[PDB]
Design a protein around this ligand. Structure first.
Ligand SMILES: Nc1ncnc2c1ncn2[C@@H]1O[C@H](COP(=O)(O)O)[C@@H](OP(=O)(O)O)[C@H]1O
Ligand SMILES: CCN(CC)CCNc1ccc(CO)c2sc3ccccc3c(=O)c12
Length: 246
């Protein structure tokens, strides 16, 4: 098993649905931030080391390739942060892998991002998200790795993450840069709602018969997840309320 598809889309662009769609197509696992959170929190420090490497005057690209290869062993595809920030390195490692860019309206994206993964520091909802996440074992080391991967994707050392104007411009620039860097023949831009047809044609497979394209990980469900984690203090006690997520 080797990487066949590199997902370059940012969080809140349908990455979890795309992860599930690729798992349906290939019958093998796809990487996602939820793999780290729910299955392999030991990966956090490894990702942090690779992101740290990118800051050096000369990044040891072979150290990065080797670390990515180890992290992705057993997976057929990648989506989401932190992996999407390494899409160029993955393209070099896997010259036959195709690239997907999941994308959506930038204002819809910003609202989703602020509600679920990156609230403003002045938003009281941030404390609720953090309290729920603590139930999952998430701590400051996870948030540092995730923020660092986002800053790496946006190519910035210093960025005011609390400024919506900055985030909107970074989102547009990131998506533009993917389209400039990946040759069009190697890239599929998949807009929220596009479903199976373009994806299956791009990957040389048939449309899965009787299986609908996934629609996972809505902000409504995520807000409920935070609320129920806070209320019950146990993932296992609430997982029956959240089918089709992990
Ligand atoms: N098949 C589909 N059709 C429409 N929206 C979808 C979808 N699959 C996922 N989404 C939306 O993609 C976002 C989740 O992305 P990610 O998995 O990258 O975090 C959520 O947006 P909202 O927060 O606006 O509901 C979710 O509703
Ligand atoms: C109930 C919600 N909880 C658990 C699911 C959110 C857990 N947190 C995250 C989950 C998924 C993703 C990307 O998919 C990110 S990305 C990011 C990027 C920058 C800073 C933080 C984050 C971040 O904290 C996060």
């Amino acid at each position: 098993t080797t990487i066949q598809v590199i997902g370059a889309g940012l969080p809140r662009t349908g990455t979890n649905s795309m992860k599930k769609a690729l798992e349906i197509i290939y019958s093998k696992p796809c990487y996602h931030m939820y793999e780290i959170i729910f299955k392999k929190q030991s990966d956090i420090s490894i990702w942090q080391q690779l992101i740290d490497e990118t800051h050096k005057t000369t990044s040891d690209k072979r150290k990065i390739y080797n670390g990515l290869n180890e992290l992705l062993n057993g997976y057929i595809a990648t989506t989401d942060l932190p992996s999407c920030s390494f899409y160029k390195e993955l393209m070099t490692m896997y010259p036959n892998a195709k690239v997907l860019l999941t994308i959506r309206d930038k204002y819809d994206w910003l609202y989703s991002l602020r509600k679920v993964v990156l609230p403003k520091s002045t938003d009281p909802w941030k404390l609720k998200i953090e309290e729920g996440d603590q139930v999952l074992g998430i701590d400051s080391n996870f948030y540092k790795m995730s923020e660092d991967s986002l800053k790496f994707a946006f190519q910035k050392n210093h960025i005011n993450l609390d400024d919506d104007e900055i985030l909107l411009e970074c989102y547009d620039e990131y998506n533009r840069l993917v389209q400039e860097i990946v040759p069009p023949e190697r890239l599929l831009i998949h807009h929220l709602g596009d479903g199976w047809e373009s994806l299956c044609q791009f990957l040389n497979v048939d449309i899965p018969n009787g299986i609908s394209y996934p629609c996972a990980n809505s902000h409504h469900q995520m807000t409920q997840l935070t609320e129920q984690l806070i209320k019950h203090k146990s993932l296992d006690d609430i997982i029956h309320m959240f089918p089709g997520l992990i």
